[PDB]
Design a protein around this ligand. Sequence first.
Ligand SMILES: Cc1cn([C@H]2C[C@H](O)[C@@H](COP(=O)(O)NP(=O)(O)OP(=O)(O)O)O2)c(=O)[nH]c1=O
Ligand SMILES: [Mn+2]
Ligand SMILES: [Mn+2]
Ligand code: NA
Ligand code: NA
Length: 326
Amino acid sequence: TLNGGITDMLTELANFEKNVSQAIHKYNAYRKAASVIAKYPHKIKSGAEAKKLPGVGTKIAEKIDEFLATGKLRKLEKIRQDDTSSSINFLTRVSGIGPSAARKFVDEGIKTLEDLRKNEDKLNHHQRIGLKYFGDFEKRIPREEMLQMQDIVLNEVKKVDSEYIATVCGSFRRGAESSGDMDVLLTHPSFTSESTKQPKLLHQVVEQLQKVHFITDTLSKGETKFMGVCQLPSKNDEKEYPHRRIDIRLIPKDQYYCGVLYFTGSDIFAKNMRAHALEKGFTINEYTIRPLGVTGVAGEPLPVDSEKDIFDYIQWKYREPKDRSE
DNA sequence: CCGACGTCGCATCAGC
DNA sequence: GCTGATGCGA
DNA sequence: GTCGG
Ligand SMILES: Cc1cn([C@H]2C[C@H](O)[C@@H](COP(=O)(O)NP(=O)(O)OP(=O)(O)O)O2)c(=O)[nH]c1=O
Ligand SMILES: [Mn+2]
Ligand SMILES: [Mn+2]
Ligand code: NA
Ligand code: NA
């Protein structure tokens, strides 16, 4: 954490441009610069040194100079005491609330935590639940708790159909000592790129995980993606565990490796990999890696049978999950 | 300079 | 009801 | 905001 103050500054700038300015690319530029600096093994002595890194240009270099000299950045000081910006930035932290909904909520005077509670009738379902567990969602999950949840999910899954395979991707698979949520890839042999030989495949798993009071809430649900809330069971006389966000993704069994690559992350690592795939003339999603034609239009799925195979096509040495934490 | 910036799932709304 | 765009999220 | 070309 050598360059902690800097990466925080850029991350805060990223949040600003996303939530307030609604400038998504600026937001990704800051997050990209913060990431490349995050894994820079030196304590940066000057902006020009940082400018030697990709994703770090003139404007950020100048801001880094200002930060390194004063210990602060004036643009952020101004933003911090801007009440509208501070209000919008806050509302966006509630799940289901983005820059647009936050901005309009502020136009109605709804700009604090109680504002959201007394005006509960103005939220859709996602925002209602996202506010219901705002406090709990702020807490991280120690890896120890992640391990408990994986036993439950994997065993409950086993009980519905023993051919379900369930893998816990996300930062957990990246070996993080603490995660922000739980991410689960799911594969049943009846669901391939060829056919859905069984309906309700994901529904029945959600159903089972609700029966055991593991999944307490749903933010959204489809035939391939679930977004909701879970909770570890506490013993007698114990304070309850915080409610945890959970994501479940049903991906066609034969397209597992593109799926496990996608959901393992990190999100930036992905964005850099897929952007590199393009420069090599490939396009990767959670399903397939495919070549790009002479006209841009992608061709047929190339054969993939390992995580490493996808790294090969784009001329990248395989990086274990632990090393994708950009 | 400038075009492009990973890719896609669900909720939701506009328009028909 | 559907198609496509938009908002928010993975 | 950055950068390839
Ligand atoms: C949010 C998000 C996720 N993803 C992919 C990569 C993430 O690793 C994976 C899971 O989403 P997440 O749980 O929001 N990210 P996380 O598991 O990497 O980090 P954390 O430990 O939950 O905070 O999905 C993207 O590719 N773009 C995104 O914007
Ligand atoms: Mn996660
Ligand atoms: Mn997640
Ligand atoms: Na640079
Ligand atoms: Na949000």
